[PDB]
Amino acid sequence: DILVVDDEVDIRDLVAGILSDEGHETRTAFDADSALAAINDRAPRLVFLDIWLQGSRLDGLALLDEIKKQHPELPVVMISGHGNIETAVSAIRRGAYDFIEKPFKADRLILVAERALETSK
Amino acid sequence: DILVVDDEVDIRDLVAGILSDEGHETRTAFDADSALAAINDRAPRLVFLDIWLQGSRLDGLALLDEIKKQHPELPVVMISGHGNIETAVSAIRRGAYDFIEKPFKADRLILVAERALETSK
Ligand code: BEF
Ligand code: BEF
Numbered sequence: 551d552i553l554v555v556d557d558e559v560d561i562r563d564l565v566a567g568i569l570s571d572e573g574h575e576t577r578t579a580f581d582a583d584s585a586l587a588a589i590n591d592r593a594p595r596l597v598f599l600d601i602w603l604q605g606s607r608l609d610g611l612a613l614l615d616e617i618k619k620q621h622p623e624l625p626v627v628m629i630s631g632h633g634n635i636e637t638a639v640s641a642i643r644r645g646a647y648d649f650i651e652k653p654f655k656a657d658r659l660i661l662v663a664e665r666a667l668e669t670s671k
Numbered sequence: 672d673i674l675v676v677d678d679e680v681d682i683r684d685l686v687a688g689i690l691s692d693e694g695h696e697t698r699t700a701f702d703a704d705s706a707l708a709a710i711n712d713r714a715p716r717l718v719f720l721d722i723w724l725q726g727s728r729l730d731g732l733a734l735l736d737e738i739k740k741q742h743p744e745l746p747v748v749m750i751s752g753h754g755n756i757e758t759a760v761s762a763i764r765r766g767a768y769d770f771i772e773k774p775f776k777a778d779r780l781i782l783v784a785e786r787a788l789e790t791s792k
């Protein structure tokens with residue numbers, strides 16, 4: 551199972567769509583509280599997290615920290631157009647499996663998801 | 672005890688100089704085989720690694736892999752002007768403690784060195 555967290559509908563749909571077409575059951579969330587509620591209901595096997603979450607209680611990096619604190623075993627991959635070297639290093643040090651830069655190619659998204667799912671329940 | 676690995680003398684001198692002035696015993700190496708020889712002789716407490724090592728048998732990332740294989744406990748920090756998000760993510764996933772972008776400020780270098788030395792022998 552994959553949970554995609556992004557404040558933009560077009561990105562949630564584009565990511566869930568690409569992954570669903572490859573045979574992965576994908577759910578979406580639009581902010582930190584909808585993401586945490588979706589994980590607390592039934593933990594997915596992988597989480598894709600945006601960083602700049604407009605109107606969210608937590609940005610994607612604080613959300614990564616909260617997810618990794620409750621579920622250290624749950625792989626989390628960042629997907630963001632707001633990265634730089636310092637931000638990507640911070641994400642990996644804080645527990646993210648990988649960092650996908652926006653704009654991404656479909657095969658890169660699938661390659662990373664399947665690598666992370668090999669490291670999941 | 673810090674080992675600085677860079678193919679450029681001006682960078683080896685600039686990094687060893689800044690760290691020596693703060694009271695850290697620093698040694699230098701110019702390529703993968705001089706770095707591995709220095710480590711095998713006596714393991715340092717921290718290694719600073721450049722990535723593009725002109726004339727070296729291994730680039731800095733392959734050298735990071737070799738160092739982390741023999742000494743998983745030895746902190747390694749990348750210092751490079753050849754980084755990007757994918758390269759920095761790769762370095763942290765492969766065991767680097769942190770990634771310092773060139774050009775760097777002296778206080779950033781010292782801060783990162785002292786954080787990594789807190790995690791060393
Ligand atoms: F809004 Be995300 F960090 F691309
Ligand atoms: F030659 Be290094 F990667 F700045």
Ligand SMILES: [Mg+2]
Pocket residue numbers: 556557558600601602603604
């Ligand atoms: Mg966003």
Ligand SMILES: [Mg+2]
Pocket residue numbers: 677678679721722723724725
């Ligand atoms: Mg170089």
